[PDB]
Amino acid sequence: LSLAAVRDALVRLEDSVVFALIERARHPRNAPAYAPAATAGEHSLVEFFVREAEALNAKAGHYQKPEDVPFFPQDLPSPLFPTKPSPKVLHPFASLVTVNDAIWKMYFDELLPLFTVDGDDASYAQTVALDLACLQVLSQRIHIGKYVAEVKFKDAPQEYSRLIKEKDSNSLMDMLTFKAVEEKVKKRVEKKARTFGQNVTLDDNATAGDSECKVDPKVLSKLYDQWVMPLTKDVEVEYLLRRLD
Amino acid sequence: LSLAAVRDALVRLEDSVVFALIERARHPRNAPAYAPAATAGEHSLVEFFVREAEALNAKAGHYQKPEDVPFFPQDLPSPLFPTKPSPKVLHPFASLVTVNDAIWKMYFDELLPLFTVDGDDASYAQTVALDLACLQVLSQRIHIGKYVAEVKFKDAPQEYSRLIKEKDSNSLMDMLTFKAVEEKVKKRVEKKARTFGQNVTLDDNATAGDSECKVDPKVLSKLYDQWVMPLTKDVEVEYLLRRLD
Numbered sequence A, B: 001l002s003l004a005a006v007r008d009a010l011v012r013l014e015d016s017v018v019f020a021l022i023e024r025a026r027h028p029r030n031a032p033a034y035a036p037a038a039t040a041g042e043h044s045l046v047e048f049f050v051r052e053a054e055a056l057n058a059k060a061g062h063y064q065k066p067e068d069v070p071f072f073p074q075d076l077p078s079p080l081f082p083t084k085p086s087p088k089v090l091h092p093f094a095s096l097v098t099v100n101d102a103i104w105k106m107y108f109d110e111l112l113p114l115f116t117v118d119g120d121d122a123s124y125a126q127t128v129a130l131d132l133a134c135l136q137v138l139s140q141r142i143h144i145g146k147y148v149a150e151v152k153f154k155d156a157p158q159e160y161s162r163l164i165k166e167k168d169s170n171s172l173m174d175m176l177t178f179k180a181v182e183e184k185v186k187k188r189v190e191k192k193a194r195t196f197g198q199n200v201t202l203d204d205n206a207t208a209g210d211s212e213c214k215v216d217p218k219v220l221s222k223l224y225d226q227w228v229m230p231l232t233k234d235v236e237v238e239y240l241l242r243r244l245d
Helices: A003-024 A045-059 A100-115 A124-143 A145-155 A157-165 A169-176 A179-196 A217-242 B003-024 B045-059 B100-115 B124-143 B145-155 B157-165 B169-176 B179-197 B217-240
Strands: none
Touching: A003 A124, A003 A145, A003 A179, A003 A217, A003 B003, A045 A124, A045 B045, A100 A124, A100 A217, A124 A145, A124 A217, A145 A157, A145 A169, A145 A217, A157 A169, A157 A217, A169 A217, A179 A217, A179 B179, B003 B124, B003 B145, B003 B179, B003 B217, B045 B124, B100 B124, B100 B217, B124 B145, B124 B217, B145 B157, B145 B169, B145 B217, B157 B169, B157 B217, B169 B217, B179 B217
């Protein structure tokens, strides 16, 4: 709908990502929570939890907005409850894009080792809820790329449609990319990790660098640079390619 | 085992409470989520959701420590996964005290209006999940009172036992109360809301007041002074009244 409204939604999720990483970092790696199951049909604890959690959310009316995308879509029940009609702001077919399969692999294989200490407390059930909270914030921010794409498309429609007709993802990627905004996002996300992960005490005693921080602010910089922003841009490109259907 | 470790665990919960309130305030009141006639049956959307999410958590191994207390205990299932027996640090019978029904009442009746603006987006499923995270962090904080009661008992067991045998609630309450520390907590919990709720910006010159804070820092002071700290103390008095059984 609005250039500024979409940007505000993204900025606000910077705080939600810092928060969610800080809270999950309260526990160690807790690897038994992710160990796989002996059989098919039996799952790991984290998969069992998410599949069950997403079914409950679906009954409560979740996943009816294009930025709210589940990790396990096939099994999902209908909402049990009355649902307000969609605003319908995006191209419907281009809206069905999902990179959740990639967010999942990224979180467990690459993210978790960066902000989570080696070790094991018994708190597997608490841990997997905190993982789902991380996976959901990441996935909402990344799939807002659908609105980012629409908003850019409507701003320069003749220039974008020319590239869509020629199926030219590489040139679409270049036009989408605002590298100077990306560098601001990374610095601000670093500053947010510094502000929220700080040990707040009533004295304002000096601290040596980020050694006091619950999550290393360079991790937030690195997450955004390597995964969040590249996967959001993947979503815009996939959206834009379908935007003329 | 250590009173400093127990207070360190309660200090870390200060940030979790601020995060959870900030995150729930992303949405407005969304009252139909709590209205029982909005959904079929005598249950509201939030009550339905929490019952289902608690049964899921129980299956994942949750609610196996005395600080982890569910709002709907009567209906909780067994863990699907193996829980390895853990160290018995607390009195078994006195461990079972739960003030969760008072926490639930104060959250929906007293707290929600304070940090949640009037209005309605249809985001009911996100709201009720954000409400449960609030409820879970308040309950854990408050029921860590059990651990507080226990260390305070073991270090002065004889004068504590005599006040238990006499069933003296007011004198147990004056033994437990450290008003100077309560005042640190009220001011620090408020500083954390001010720090974590501000709009963090790449301007070092810029400063903003509590008007820009996502949750009024004074709401956090009030929360602790009115409900969190008294309810934690209700737990440790009711813990001690059973400590000789």
